[PDB]
Amino acid sequence: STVPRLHRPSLQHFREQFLVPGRPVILKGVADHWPCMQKWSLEYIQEIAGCRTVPVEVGWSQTLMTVNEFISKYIVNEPRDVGYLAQHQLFDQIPELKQDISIPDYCSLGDGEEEEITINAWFGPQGTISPLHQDPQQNFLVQVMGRKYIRLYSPQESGALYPHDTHLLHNTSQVDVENPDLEKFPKFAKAPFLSCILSPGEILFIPVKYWHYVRALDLSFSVSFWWS
Ligand SMILES: O=C(O)C[C@@H]1CC(=O)N(O)C1=O
Ligand SMILES: [Mn+2]
């Protein structure tokens, strides 16, 4: 039930053993020496991005503030609520930061165009939680700062995850993974899963439609690549 870790697997090995069957894996030795891994201090983030406006999810509402405000209020000064700079195309907004990352070569195995890969930043304090849900594209999730606990359930287990009925929320589970209501959601308890702690320099492959749940264990910065 652990996600396997592979060092720089060949494109063919990744394609045949993980991409085509839709199996998660952690890629080591791929992003570990990207510039972001050494450069992205809080101070560097403030210097490069501090004055720019970013969307922040407050745990639930959505607001806007500068990066400096986000750091001051939700990171450094004993925050009062949880705030998460989540799912934001920060690298389109701030092209200088795009210099510190790369598109993984494995994305070339997809059917889509490189121009259509979506690169999102996920920057927040210890304790951010993304509830269990599934996405409609493949994902490489690159961990830069801090660690994340991640739980993964196959699409084959969707019945045991009790998706919301609304079309809007049908890709999201009704269950709180880490404190499930087994009186209401009894099938959840026996559903098999994989899990990991994703650390800096590692890349998690989340296959298209794989259900995933994520909790930050430390001050955390991740970069995701959504591709097909
Ligand atoms: O890290 C998180 O809190 C949530 C993750 C990051 C990511 O790329 N996707 O699709 C998520 O759901
Ligand atoms: Mn997701």
Numbering used by the authors: 182 to 240, 248 to 416
Question: Any passages from the paper?
Answer:
JMJD5 is a 2-oxoglutarate (2OG) and Fe(II) dependent oxygenase of the JmjC subfamily, which includes histone Nε-methyl lysine-demethylases (KDMs) and hydroxylases catalysing formation of stable alcohol products. The results support the assignment of JMJD5 as a protein hydroxylase and reveal JMJD5 has an unusually compact 2OG binding pocket suitable for exploitation in development of selective inhibitors.
Analyses of the difference density (Fo-Fc) maps around the active site in the four structures reveal that all the crystallised inhibitors coordinate the metal ion in a bidentate manner and bind in the JMJD5 2OG pocket. As anticipated, in all the structures the catalytically inactive active site manganese (substituting for iron) is coordinated by the side chains of H321, D323, and H400. Our structure of 4 with JMJD5 implies stereoselective binding of a single enantiomer (the 3S-enantiomer) despite use of a racemic mixture for crystallisation. Comparison of the binding modes of 2,4-PDCA and 4 at the JMJD5 active site reveals that the binding modes of the rings of the two inhibitors overlap, implying that modification of them to optimised potency should be possible and suggesting that binding of bicyclic inhibitors such as IOX1/ ML-324 might reflect an approximate composite of the binding modes of 2,4-PDCA and 4. Furthermore, the functionalised 8-hydroxyisoquinoline inhibitor ML-324 (a JmjC KDM inhibitor)37 was markedly more potent than the simpler 5-carboxy-8-hydroxyquinoline (IOX1), a relatively broad spectrum 2OG oxygenase inhibitor that has been shown to induce iron movement at the active site of some JmjC KDMs 38.
